[PDB]
Design a protein around this ligand. Structure first.
Ligand code: CDL
Ligand code: CDL
Ligand code: CDL
Ligand code: CDL
Ligand code: HEA
Ligand code: HEA
Ligand code: PEE
Ligand code: PEE
Ligand code: PER
Ligand code: CU
Ligand code: K
Ligand code: ZN
Lengths: 180, 107, 62, 65, 459, 230, 61, 226
């Protein structure tokens, strides 16, 4: 089945580009005049006065929430008394169809399974050992060649001719011994 | 290394011959982008988002207990998208030990 | 500490809902367009939903 | 308030003004121009041409164009 | 407000946003290079304007490292999730966090303004004297940016170190990666500031450190003493992200957590004492070269352990879970790509092999595979993993197999030929080249234009 | 109950301080830089005001956080000096045989060591009084006299030296290392000018910071004295 | 002394504990934004002119 | 607790200048209607009036004596609420370690709101597993999917309020016989005579009852320069 067709009705295609009419037709920049919405603009976004120009964190509209007894309003649990016991019924979230749209049917089955863990401690320790020392053996294999080639570069040689090279911007200068 | 909880043979003995592992689906359902309603203003869309949190969901077992959404790290425990103030009450990391004191018990 | 920033506060109720003169509920900008085209495919993917759960995430062509 | 629960609530609730996105893209576009415009200006300053013709600094055949 | 915000999660977003914006200029600079290198002869840069090309490569390197990748991996993701991974509410030093992002922006504006107003010349991102100290004022401006950037990096490092005091949970592997990176900055940055001041002294205060009887090689030691820890500072946060993604998306506990943590610590200790493999061709003493070569190879041992631990995380994961998510693909791609970059690093660690491959495009390809592919993909992978938490939309990147495949194919086309060119040989930091290297340079150029087109598809 | 931390939501000094920094680059007159430096000093003071006001939160970890920050700063100062020592000793092979007059090992080193040791003793007495919840007015003015002599001696030494920064890398390193120490002495003046008695005493991060910083400056000079004068 | 009458400690950010004084100090610096832009823009013009970048076209005409 | 700072001077006693000037109404206000400062001085004035009358103490029952000093008699309900308050306060800056949770004895997770983030680390030794974080919401018996440890949320809630020391006192403490101002005067004359004031709170309190500035030296005591 096509699950999109189930909630097609909720999705009505839009009219304006980006969801707003031109400001001339409707001024969404102004604060809403509706009672209880003085902190919102006409389009529903928070007004600059509420968030910037008169932000409460800056000392505007000072109103301490806590009361004299150091209390704030707290909503209680849904309590039920049955079978000689006081029970609390937890709040279950609404069906995912309401929030997401797809109808919650024909859900693929995914069973409970505990964590996938590597076992056989003895075997695992050897693997960890190899992870460390196999690279180490490779390094040791390279070390001896490295020493040898370094010594070859710096070997003292019985040179018989010298050429002096000077680098300048932007050319090379060569000085050589002229034969007698 | 961790290899699961230790199990004793007696713990595997069933009380009935027809017991099999419960076939409860742990797929939370079918989801997609959270779809808001055009009629809902900023405040009510916030309520809508708070009611679509997967980390508030769980699976109820046959004995009434629930296995919740769980994660290795606490990054998956805040509301999505992350709110300005996340951990108002300090998350509790529960450790277990065998120590006990008499005051906790009564005879 | 008495008088300090509360560790929990209940949300105040949302502001009053707005209706047009004819009674239609007022709509607000919503950046979830319904693109127009002839494609209607629906792709579903089993997704990690923690350590012990999954969710069948669907992508719709529209 | 419920509106203040989420950081950048208007964007996250999909009500933000599109101009914010345009400015972000424009800012990126302007950043890119800082590599192209001085290239053109410097080429003209030292050569009198905004851009070279390919291989114009090398010997070209008679019919090359 | 927008600039006054101290919320760490908001600041984390700003770091990611700013890195993308600056990334465009870095991409433009990178695109200018490959267009010029399409074939022998000038293409978009006049022969009389070769100085501009030197500036392009200098800025491309500087912007990408200090202004794009480092803020993205060390400023962006860490500021968003690190206080969440810890059980704490917000960052320890909120006001310092605000000024750090503002400092990064101001330094960027100074750098780009210098392009527009000053004469355009270049000396490489390493700013080797005496060339750096005989240049024009654009070099002075770039120094101010680096010093200013250094201030932001150090204060941000101080911010993360304070998490140890307040952390109310367990120090996860990711937290360790950020902490150790902060330690590297604390020990390496002051050395960088000292030598940079000496560069300013010669440029602006008539100092004579970098003229005859003053060893110019002195700069290379102090610079690279910070230079190599920097590359490890860039990558270590990427390692932390990969560890989280692989464990989370496979529902597998991180194997050998302590081995991973010790590997990160070991890399930092070794990374602080191997800087001179950047100075093989200068003529160091025989024993000195042997020491650095030997210690440089040892860095592979801890780095190898992390690679193998990552592999076993992916092995054995449930088949039912869909494996085509972009975050998972990028995390797996990192292992494949990093191994290529690291192995080539070991090849050029052998100093005699390096004699032929120093200052060649083989070195370019080496650090591009690690940074341009690996680090970027790790940063992309982390952002994708946190898409729901961050909450961004209006992009098609979460499930886009075309983007992953095309990106992987085309970036490999750019930089695989550069390995081959290194033996041919083509020097780095060069605009013209011999006609017989065109084929490989042409192929990489086709790769560069293709990658830019792919980026437009995400929107 | 209450939240563990009283979050700080907004701040505007960061923008001002960052802009002040930019003014240094965009100046067309060195006079603007002088006045710009005063603005930086003012705004940094405001930031220090916020730290003092945070005491109202009564958070036990605030002292620890600031103390460890200072430790990191101290390390950065040490490593900065290390780089100068590194620069000095790299060219060590070129010293002592060039036709320049290096400094004497009798006059400057001894009086400076004696003078700076007295500075340490004064600060130590301040710490002891801070432990005993006690104050001595004269102590601060001894520091000012100590700093006055140090400034007077260093000014004359530079003016009467017969070799210049451009003569050799040795001279450059001598002048630069000595200047770097002076700047850290001047930073100490910036800190010590506000020393007062505060009645909340051992929960004041300023006292421990001043004691640590003054000790660092003096020990650094011992290293300088051994390297250059002796 | 009453603990519940000090809620301004957490209701108001510390940067504005001073009431109008703190706000006035913030507002004063805000007035300097555009003067700064003109000043900064002049420096760019100064460098641009001194480098003869305005004569790009006149040089080759 | 370890996460608290140093005791303030007010944590021990309040200055007399904070005493409400309308003492006559203060001693007649019901406990539920007294603020923190008013409640402090009501208990101190009434508590010290009974303690500074030695001849009556031996004949006074502990219930009456506790009431006069403002101390709350402990009972299972009040003890339960106070105990969970201190446990919540302790866990603000202390680790959360205890016995393994089972259906009979679930792990108790105190919270003020309807939700609190918790992590399960399994059992002891080998049974300990990697941290598994979950959101513990009210009204569900949570079961760890790995070790099967049982968690439960306990809410410190009562009649649209959350449990506090003052809330417990108001709910359970019952106001006794109204305080008699004659006792204040009688004890005042006992310890305050001919310029000797060994009972100073009563001296101030008696002065306020008589108006203000009536007793010797009180006008000079109340006159301030700034
Ligand atoms: C690397 C690339 C590829 C990356 C791929 C991977 C990406 C993965 C995803 C990454 C996601 C990261 C996390 C994202 C989180 C997002 C959260 C968010 O949205 O926060 C809300 C945040 C704000 O939302 P809000 O909460 O509603 O804010 C309300 C405002 O605060 C208040 O509203 P207001 O209306 O009052 O606003 C005030 C407004 C007032 O507005 C106006 O008045 C507007 C007026 C119109 C102006 C329009 C511009 C005009 C330009 C004219 C040019 C003329 C040229 C002429 C040339 C002539 C040549 C001959 O502005 C101002 O007053 C100040 C503006 C200053 C900033 C803009 C500066 C522009 C550039 C300036 C350049 C100057 C150059 C000078 C050089 C001189 C040198 C000498 O969003 C944004 O800011 C937009 C973000 C958009 C991106 C979101 C992420 C999407 C995913 C990525 C997409 C790809 C992007 C690629 C980069 C761009 C390419 C170009
Ligand atoms: C003893 C001697 C005494 C001497 C005394 C002398 C005194 C001298 C005084 C010296 C100091 C002067 C300055 C004082 C500052 C005072 C601060 C203060 O208290 O402010 C309170 C004040 C509160 O404002 P308000 O009066 O309540 O009204 C605010 C609004 O109502 C609504 O509130 P809001 O805060 O949300 O609104 C602000 C914001 C709201 O608007 C938005 O945010 C727009 C929406 C976002 C769109 C997407 C933007 C891109 C994404 C960026 C992501 C990273 C963001 C990082 C965080 C923000 C960094 C700025 O718009 C802006 O302010 C502009 C935002 C710019 C964002 C830049 C992002 C990157 C751009 C990349 C450009 C790429 C092209 C390259 C070429 C061009 C280079 C320049 O602060 C502000 O909100 C305004 C700050 C304005 C000053 C900013 C100065 C920036 C200078 C930059 C360097 C330029 C130099 C080189 C020039 C080159 C030109 C080409
Ligand atoms: C002949 C000479 C003899 C000389 C003898 C001298 C004797 C000296 C004795 C020293 C004894 C130390 C006692 C204290 C131990 C540490 C306790 C501690 O920190 O308490 C937490 C304490 C917070 O209290 P808390 O509430 O208990 O913390 C709960 C946890 O957060 C909650 O975490 P959790 O419960 O999940 O886990 C607990 C634990 C989890 O972690 C641990 O338990 C780590 C345990 C190992 C630590 C290392 C011990 C030494 C190992 C042997 C090394 C020998 C090298 C020999 C070389 C010889 C060459 C000749 O957490 C921590 O330890 C957190 C702090 C870690 C800071 C690490 C900083 C990087 C340093 C490098 C790491 C160590 C690598 C060792 C070598 C590795 C390769 C084999 O931390 C702080 O107060 C944070 C302050 C941060 C300040 C940062 C700025 C400092 C200045 C930086 C300057 C530059 C530094 C450069 C470093 C370069 C590194 C490569
Ligand atoms: C018949 C008279 C014979 C007099 C012989 C000369 C004696 C002179 C003694 C001068 C000692 C100055 C020591 C300076 C270090 C700071 C002292 C200190 O902490 O004071 C705290 C003291 C009280 O501080 P506080 O915070 O209130 O209380 C802190 C403690 O709780 C409580 O603090 P405390 O009470 O424990 O303080 C103990 C003591 C701690 O210090 C000492 O005990 C150090 C003693 C060092 C002895 C140095 C003698 C130098 C003589 C050299 C002569 C050379 C001649 C060469 C000839 C050449 C021929 C070719 O501090 C003092 O007593 C300082 C001196 C107080 C005098 C203040 C009134 C103004 C100056 C009056 C000078 C009168 C001179 C008359 C000469 C007549 C000769 C016949 O500070 C003050 O009184 C206020 C500031 C003024 C004090 C310094 C005054 C300097 C006067 C110098 C006079 C000698 C000039 C020689 C010139 C030679 C040129 C060639
Ligand atoms: C994130 C950036 C990054 C990272 C991680 C690295 C990592 C490494 N780099 Fe790189 N490097 C750069 C960025 C980076 N580098 C840059 C930008 C330059 C040029 C700067 C300039 O000149 O401008 C550079 C230059 C550079 C040079 C040449 C310097 C010169 O002369 O110009 C060398 C020489 O050895 C080198 C080596 C290494 C090594 C040995 C590693 C190691 O960390 C790699 C280790 C990883 C592996 C080896 C793979 C994983 C391990 C295994 C698969 C198993 C074990 C393997 C073995 C035992 C072989 N780098
Ligand atoms: C992070 C660092 C970084 C990154 C991403 C890149 C990316 C690229 N670089 Fe490189 N490059 C350097 C750092 C970087 N580079 C350095 C340090 C040098 C040495 C400088 C010197 O010579 O002194 C250099 C040198 C260099 C040269 C040699 C110049 C010369 O010597 O003449 C060339 C030539 O083609 C080149 C090409 C490219 C190309 C084609 C890309 C890219 O196009 C590859 C593909 C990438 C994309 C198509 C863009 C993808 C998006 C992003 C990278 C941003 C993402 C942002 C976020 C996620 C927030 N680079
Ligand atoms: C160029 C080289 C550098 C010089 C240029 C300027 C660099 C400016 C950088 C300054 C960094 C300051 C970091 C401070 C970190 C520590 C803060 C700290 O502990 O302060 C608190 C501590 C104690 O306060 P309590 O209320 O008791 O307790 C605090 C809460 N428990 O207070 C202090 O330290 C008091 C400090 C008083 C003196 C302040 C002087 C400020 C000097 C600024 C210098 C700027 C000069 C600029 C020159 C520009 C041109 C060259
Ligand atoms: C109170 C706190 C004090 C802390 C002070 C810390 C001081 C050190 C800070 C770091 C700087 C180190 C000094 C710089 C050393 C440079 C040496 C150098 O470049 O010399 C090489 C030769 O050097 C070597 O052989 C390399 C040795 C490596 C030195 C590394 C020293 C610093 C290491 C810091 C690592 C981080 C800390 C690790 C601590 C322990 C970790 C377990 C050049 O040789 P040639 O040019 O061929 O000349 C030879 C004769 N013509
Ligand atoms: O640098 O590797
Ligand atoms: Cu290196
Ligand atoms: K070319
Ligand atoms: Zn468990």
């Amino acid at each position: 089945k096509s699950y999109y067709d189930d909630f097609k009705d909720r999705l009505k295609p839009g009219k304006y580009t980006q969801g707003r009419c031109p400001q001339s037709e409707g001024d969404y920049r102004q604060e809403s005049k509706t009672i209880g919405r003085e902190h919102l603009n006409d389009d529903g976004t928070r007004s600059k006065r509420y968030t910037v120009k008169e932000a409460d964190a800056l000392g505007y509209h000072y109103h301490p929430p806590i009361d004299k007894k150091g209390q704030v309003y707290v909503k209680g649990p849904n309590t039920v008394i049955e079978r000689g016991q006081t029970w609390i019924k937890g709040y279950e979230l609404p069906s995912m169809e309401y929030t997401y749209g797809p109808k919650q049917e024909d859900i693929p089955f995914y069973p409970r399974v505990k964590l996938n863990v590597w076992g056989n401690y003895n075997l695992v320790m050897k693997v960890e050992f190899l992870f460390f020392y196999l690279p180490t053996i490779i390094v040791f294999g390279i070390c001896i060649p490295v020493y040898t080639i370094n010594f070859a570069q710096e070997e003292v040689i019985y040179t018989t001719m010298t050429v002096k090279v000077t680098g300048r911007q932007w050319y090379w200068v060569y000085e050589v011994e002229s034969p007698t | 290394i961790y290899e699961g909880q230790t199990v004793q043979e007696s713990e595997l003995i069933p009380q009935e011959d027809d017991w099999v592992i419960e076939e409860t689906n742990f797929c939370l359902g079918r989801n997609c982008y959270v779809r808001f309603r055009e009629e809902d203003d900023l405040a009510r869309r916030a309520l809508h988002q708070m009611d679509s949190q997967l980390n508030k969901m769980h699976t109820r077992l046959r004995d009434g207990t629930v296995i919740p959404y769980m994660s290795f790290h606490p990054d998956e425990m805040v509301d999505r998208p992350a709110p300005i103030h996340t951990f108002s009450e300090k998350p509790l990391l529960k450790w277990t030990w065998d120590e006990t004191y008499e005051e906790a018990y009564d005879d | 500490r008495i008088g300090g920033p509360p560790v929990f506060m209940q949300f105040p109720p949302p502001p009053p809902k707005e209706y047009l003169a004819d009674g239609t509920p007022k709509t607000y900008p919503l950046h979830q367009p319904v693109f127009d085209h002839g494609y209607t495919w629906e792709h579903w993917y089993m997704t990690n939903a923690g350590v012990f759960h999954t969710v069948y995430y669907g992508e719709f062509a529209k | 308030n419920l509106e203040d629960h989420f950081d950048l609530a208007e964007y996250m609730m999909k009500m933000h003004n599109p101009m914010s996105e345009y400015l972000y893209w424009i800012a990126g576009f302007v950043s890119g121009l800082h590599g192209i415009l001085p290239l053109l200006h410097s080429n003209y300053y030292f050569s009198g041409m905004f851009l070279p013709r390919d291989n114009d600094n090398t010997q070209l055949c008679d019919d090359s164009w | 407000f927008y600039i006054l915000v101290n919320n760490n999660k908001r600041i984390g977003i700003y770091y990611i946003k700013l890195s993308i914006i600056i990334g465009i200029l870095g991409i433009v600079l990178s695109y200018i290079i490959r267009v010029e290198l399409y074939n022998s002869g000038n293409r978009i840069i006049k022969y009389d304007n070769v100085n501009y090309y030197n500036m392009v490569i200098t800025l491309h390197g500087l912007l990408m490292i200090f202004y794009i990748i480092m803020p993205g991996l060390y400023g962006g993701i860490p500021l968003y999730i690190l206080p969440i991974l810890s059980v704490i509410t917000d960052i320890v030093l909120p006001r310092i966090n605000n000024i750090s992002i503002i400092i990064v922006l101001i330094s960027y504006i100074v750098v780009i303004n210098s392009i527009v107003i000053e004469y355009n010349i270049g000396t490489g991102w390493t700013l080797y004297p005496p060339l750096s100290i005989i240049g024009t004022v654009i070099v002075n401006m770039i120094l101010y940016g680096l010093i200013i950037i250094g201030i932001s990096s150090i204060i941000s490092a101080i911010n993360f170190m304070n998490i140890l005091i307040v952390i109310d949970g367990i120090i996860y592997v990711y937290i360790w990666s950020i902490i150790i990176t902060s330690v590297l900055l604390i020990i390496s940055l002051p050395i960088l500031n000292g030598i940079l001041l000496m560069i300013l002294s010669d440029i602006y205060f008539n100092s004579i450190y970098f003229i005859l009887n003053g060893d110019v090689v002195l700069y290379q030691h102090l610079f690279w003493y910070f230079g190599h820890p920097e590359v490890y500072i860039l990558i270590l946060p990427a390692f932390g992200i990969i560890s989280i993604i692989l464990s989370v998306l496979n529902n597998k506990i991180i194997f050998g957590m302590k081995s991973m943590i010790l590997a990160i610590i070991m890399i930092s200790i070794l990374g602080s004492i191997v800087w001179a493999h950047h100075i093989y061709t200068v003529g160091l003493e025989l024993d000195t070269k042997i020491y650095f070569n030997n210690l440089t190879l040892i860095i592979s041992i801890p780095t190898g352990n992390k690679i193998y631990n990552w592999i076993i995380l992916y092995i054995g994961s449930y088949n039912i879970l869909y494996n085509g998510y972009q975050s998972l693909i990028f995390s797996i791609m990192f292992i494949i790509i990093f191994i290529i970059g690291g192995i080539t690093g070991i090849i050029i660690s052998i100093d005699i092999i390096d004699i032929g491959l120093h200052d060649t495009y083989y070195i370019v390809s080496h650090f591009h595979y690690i940074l341009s592919i690996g680090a970027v993909i790790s940063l992309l992978a982390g952002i994708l993993l946190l898409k729901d938490i961050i909450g961004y939309y209006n992009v098609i990147i979460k499930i886009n197999k075309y983007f992953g495949l095309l990106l992987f194919i085309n970036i490999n086309i750019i930089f695989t030929p550069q390995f081959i060119i290194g033996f041919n040989v083509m020097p780095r930091r060069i605009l013209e080249y011999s006609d017989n290297i065109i084929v490989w340079n042409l192929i990489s150029s086709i790769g560069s234009i293709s990658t830019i087109l792919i980026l437009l598809s995400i929107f | 109950f209450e939240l563990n931390i009283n979050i700080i939501n907004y701040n505007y000094l960061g923008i001002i301080i960052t802009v002040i920094i930019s003014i240094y680059i965009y100046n067309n007159s060195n006079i603007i830089s002088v006045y710009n430096s005063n603005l930086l000093l003012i705004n940094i003071n405001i930031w220090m005001k916020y730290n003092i006001l945070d005491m109202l939160n009564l958070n036990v970890l605030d002292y620890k956080i600031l103390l460890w920050i200072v430790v990191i700063i101290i390390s950065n100062e040490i490593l900065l000096f290390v780089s100068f020592y590194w620069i000095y000793y790299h060219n060590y092979i070129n010293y002592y045989h060039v036709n320049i007059l290096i400094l004497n090992s009798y006059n400057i080193v001894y009086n400076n060591i004696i003078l700076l040791t007295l500075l340490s003793t004064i600060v130590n007495i301040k710490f002891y009084n801070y432990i005993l919840s006690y104050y001595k007015y004269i102590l601060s003015y001894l520091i000012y006299y100590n700093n006055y002599m140090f400034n007077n001696k260093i000014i004359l030494e530079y003016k009467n030296n017969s070799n210049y920064t451009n003569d050799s890398v040795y001279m450059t390193s001598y002048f630069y290392i000595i200047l770097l120490h002076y700047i850290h002495i001047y930073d100490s003046i910036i800190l010590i000018v506000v020393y007062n008695y505060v009645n909340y005493k051992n929960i004041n991060n300023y006292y421990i910071n001043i004691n640590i910083y003054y000790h660092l400056i003096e020990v650094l000079y011992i290293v300088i004295s051994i390297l250059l004068y002796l | 002394i009453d603990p519940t009458k000090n809620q301004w400690r957490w209701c108001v950010d510390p940067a504005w504990y001073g009431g109008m004084r703190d706000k006035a100090n913030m507002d004063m610096y805000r007035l300097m934004v555009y003067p700064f832009f003109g000043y900064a823009l002049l420096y760019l013009h100064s460098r641009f002119k001194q480098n003869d970048k305005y004569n790009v076209f006149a040089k080759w005409r | 607790y370890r996460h608290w700072h140093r005791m303030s001077e007010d944590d021990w006693a309040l200055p007399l200048d904070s005493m409400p000037e309308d003492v006559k109404t203060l001693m007649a206000t019901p406990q539920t209607e007294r603020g923190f400062v008013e409640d402090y001085w009501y208990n101190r004035i009434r508590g010290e009036a009974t303690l500074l009358d030695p001849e009556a103490l031996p004949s006074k029952s502990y219930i009456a004596l506790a009431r006069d000093m403002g101390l709350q008699i402990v009972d299972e309900p009040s003890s339960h609420m106070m105990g969970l308050i201190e446990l919540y306060e302790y866990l603000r800056g202390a680790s959360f370690v205890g016995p393994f949770g089972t259906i009979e004895n679930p792990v108790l997770v105190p919270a003020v709101g309807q939700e609190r983030v918790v992590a399960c680390t399994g059992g002891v030794g080998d049974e300990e597993h990697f941290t598994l974080w979950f959101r513990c919401r009210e009204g569900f018996m949570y079961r760890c999917g790995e070790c099967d440890q049982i968690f439960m949320l306990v809410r410190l809630y009562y009649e649209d309020r959350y449990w506090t020391q003052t809330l417990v006192r108001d709910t359970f403490m019952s106001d006794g016989d109204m305080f008699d101002l004659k006792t204040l005067e009688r004890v005042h004359k006992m310890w305050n005579k001919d310029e000797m004031v060994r009972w100073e709170v009563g001296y101030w309190a008696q002065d306020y009852v008589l108006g203000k500035g009536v007793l010797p030296g009180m006008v000079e005591e109340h006159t301030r320069v700034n």
